[PDB]
Amino acid sequence: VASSVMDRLSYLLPSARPELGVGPGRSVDRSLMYSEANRRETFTSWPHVGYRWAQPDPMAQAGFYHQPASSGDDRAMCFTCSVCLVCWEPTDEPWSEHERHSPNCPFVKGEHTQNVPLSVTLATS
Amino acid sequence: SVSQALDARLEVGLEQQAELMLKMMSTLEADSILQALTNTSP
Amino acid sequence: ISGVDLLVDQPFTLEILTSLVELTRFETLTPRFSATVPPCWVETRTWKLQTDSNSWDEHVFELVLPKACMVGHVDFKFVLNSNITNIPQIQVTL
Amino acid sequence: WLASGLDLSGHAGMLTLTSPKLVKGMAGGKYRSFLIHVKAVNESENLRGCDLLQEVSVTIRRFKKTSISKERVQRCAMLQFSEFHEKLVNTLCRKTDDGQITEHAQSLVLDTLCWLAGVHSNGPGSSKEGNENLLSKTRKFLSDIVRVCFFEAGRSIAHKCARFLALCISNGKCDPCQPAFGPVLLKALLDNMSFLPAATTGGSVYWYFVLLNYVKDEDLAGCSTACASLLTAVSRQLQDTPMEALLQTRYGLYSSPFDPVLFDLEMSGSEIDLSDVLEGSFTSLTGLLEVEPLHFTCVSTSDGTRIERDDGLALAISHASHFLQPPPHQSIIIERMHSGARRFVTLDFGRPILLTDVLIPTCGDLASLSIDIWTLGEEVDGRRLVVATDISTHSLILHDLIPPPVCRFMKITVIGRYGSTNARAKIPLGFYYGHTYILPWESELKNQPEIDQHLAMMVALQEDIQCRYNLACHRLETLLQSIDLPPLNSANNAQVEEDSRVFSAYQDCIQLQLQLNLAHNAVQRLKVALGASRKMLSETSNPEDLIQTSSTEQLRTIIRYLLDTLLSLLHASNGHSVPAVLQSTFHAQACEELFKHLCISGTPKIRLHTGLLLVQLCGGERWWGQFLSNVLQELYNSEQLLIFPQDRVFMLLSCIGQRSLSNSGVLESLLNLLDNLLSPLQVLDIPMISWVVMLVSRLLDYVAT
Amino acid sequence: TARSMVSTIMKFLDGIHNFAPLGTITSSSPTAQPAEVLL
Ligand SMILES: [Zn+2]
């Protein structure tokens, strides 16, 4: 609830919206990436949009963001457990991959975290 | 016993609980038969 | 209601019984329907129940179909607690 | 209440809610919204009632929109005017003079009967007049419909009738003036056991026996005495040649290679050693002769996955026989394993085919498997069959899909177990079962040749495989004439190219006999598909006559099944007092006759199982040691000309004596038999004396243990 | 002294072979390590 409130407050003020710095050799702001829209915005340079299950919208809602080490790779990190994931496959289901690679991730067990759903941001736009 | 596996395409039908109850008769049958083989005569 | 050609008085021909059987099938609703639940449940539609005792005595779910059509049936699937040792006396009524 | 939808585990459940009053109120065309109420009724996290639910899911399924308009009055006709229902019962009774009712029409009327029973299951104050009338018309002609459905029908019609009858069991919300379905279904079930050995399918009588075993809890005496009489009759019938007996003694070959007809084939992915008991789920897949297997061709394969194999009319007949073959065992190997190894394979049958039964062996290193089928496209007609998440516990068994789907392409998706080690394993494809010819009514569910030419070529194939089976039998007989027959009794028999060639000839004879029988079942299914019917059980038929004119394999199978029912009946007492009726009809000489007629020539499984029946029924009787002494003296004489497997029945005798050691008469009678035996040491028979002293030594080792 | 049929038909109901792995080992004095590795 508090995470959705602060994300809505950040969205209401354009002066408190820093630019999305997606690039190699530069770490991202995890506190700013608590919103789902930023996580799905990080996948603009995704080279595997044509994959059946490796699409930006289904994999971003699982709590992943694109933090590429170069131009053209598929390195997607979690914003809560920071699981190192490389060499993504077209058959890699995002929920199943997050369960397999990080069963201790709170999204797999379903407990309430600092995640901000996109519906709350759309209802408070 | 047997695997807890049932027809998923039959869930659109009305007899899913019917097959489910037939299967639990079958499992109680298997359990009772194993118990009758293992138990001796008092 | 009178003056209607019924489906009962005819002899047992193959085509009439086949049409009756082909009538009695069921289809899946498409697109998504509408429904609201009390807020203790968090999220073909699914929900997970949270331990809230504010309205434990009664629970009312409301369903609105996208179009008034021929109602076949409603499928209600549930998964209970894993540590259950006694059969609960809980009823669900439409 | 919640008790009408719980699963086997009890941790989940599903309800399908509908009513005739829903469409009765929808006839006005006014309703669009609904409410559902969850309420806890009463007479750590202490969750009570509504708080006990973990996960919920809602779906709504609509009705099929047909080309027949004004369907509202058509549906209200059966609910308002009841003269349809008894007419349906008439179509079940075959009393109407308007021709002869086929099996497809019976299936359709039974389907609509099932649908009307389902809608009439719960009537919230709605007029149940029609429901009471149809239930009364069902009970009035129940014997006729159970006779024409479970004895004079195939697997589909009998399975559907069992489904309808158990649904009538399920919705037994009868008024206080109406009796329950239990007593009457029990009486109708025992009124037709006399026609049992003249049945057709193992699965039909299997479901029949399941219903008998479930509903026998109400009344025990009549079913018990009828069952005992049928035991005695089929046991005195089965005793009537030394040929399969000699095979059983010399090589332990129990299936008759000369009787050309069987009843069913039993196999599962899970002789028998008697030491562990000193296989219950194997009855999951029955009736595999009426349904032939297929052949497998892999098309698509995922990464890190490989499917391997585990280690001019005559030409057309040979090709049709090659299409009619059990394929060798194949499997899937995985290169790299991990926790949740998601792999995908596709199998092709080569043509549209009907699929009925599927069997997947137990794979202990896999978490879950899922099967999809489709004929043309993945998104065109793809429907999910089963996903199982406990492959490591038990095997996947899915039996007699009704209605039988048609398909051409199999999709197998496998997810490996959590924390799986990186050690290679095998996932067998299992055995797939279906129908080679697609019926026109079953084709319309989801270049087809006509029935007559297809029937003719199967008849030609049946004749050719009958000739092959006859020449195989002649070769087997001429080879077994060449078996050594020493005068050293049987001790040296238990102590070779000839053995290997006999085993090969018996395996070939069994394979061709099975092929011939399933081909005969195929020509029978097409012959009844032409418009004919199977064997009609006439009312003037003597039960003993049809007992005598039944096949020996059918008699063996029916004995194993109903003595399985007897095992369940003995266990249903929960260790309490056994009823006196089956304890009184199974006296000493009847028990001795049953032992001498079933355990001497029968298969080891039914032999051990009937021994278990005898110890769980008459274990405490005073005459058991005397019976053992008599059967030892009258079986193991040096002058005994009977050809019986002395070693295996001797180990079984030791096992049943070790079970009956709780009785104090067995040890006393065996030592008295010894005292009588070496009384001349106050001619000598060294082998029989050795047999009995090693028997009493094993029994005393059990006593000491 | 020959083996008769009884030994044949009882031998399997339950070429010189080793028997050291079946038995156990011990010593009268407390050693620094047990000798079961020898077995
Ligand atoms: Zn994570």
From Swiss-Prot, chain B:
* PTM description: Ubiquitinated; mediated by RNF41 E3 ligase and leads to proteasomal degradation, impairing inhibition of apoptosis. Deubiquitinated by USP8/UBPY. Autoubiquitinated; mediated by E1 ubiquitin activating enzyme UBA6. Proteolytically cleaved. Acts as substrate for CASP3, CASP6, CASP7, CASP9 and HTRA2.
Q: Where in the cell?
A: Golgi apparatus, trans-Golgi network membrane; Endosome; Cytoplasm, Cytoskeleton, Spindle pole; Cytoplasm, Cytoskeleton, Microtubule organizing center, Centrosome
Tissue specificity, per the record, is: Expressed in brain cancer cells.
Entry's free-text remark on domains: The BIR domain is essential for its anti-apoptotic function and is important for binding to DIABLO/SMAC and caspases.
Summarizing the function annotation, the protein's role is:
Anti-apoptotic protein known as inhibitor of apoptosis (IAP) which can regulate cell death by controlling caspases and by acting as an E3 ubiquitin-protein ligase. Unlike most IAPs, does not contain a RING domain and it is not a RING-type E3 ligase. Instead acts as a dual E2/E3 enzyme that combines ubiquitin conjugating (E2) and ubiquitin ligase (E3) activities in a single polypeptide. Ubiquitination is mediated by a non-canonical E1 ubiquitin activating enzyme UBA6.
Q: Which family does it belong to?
A: Belongs to the BIRC6 family.
Q: How does it assemble?
A: Homodimer; antiparallel. Interacts with RNF41. Interacts with DIABLO/SMAC, likely with higher affinity to SMAC dimer than SMAC monomer; this interaction blocks the substrate-binding site and inhibits the caspase inhibition activity of BIRC6. Interacts with KIF23/MKLP1, USP8/UBPY, BIRC5/survivin, MAP2K1/MEK1, RAB8A/RAB8, RAB11A/RAB11, PLK1, EXOC3/SEC6 and EXOC4/SEC8.
Name recorded for this polypeptide:
Dual E2 ubiquitin-conjugating enzyme/E3 ubiquitin-protein ligase BIRC6
- Lineage of the species this protein comes from: Eukaryota, Metazoa, Chordata, Craniata, Vertebrata
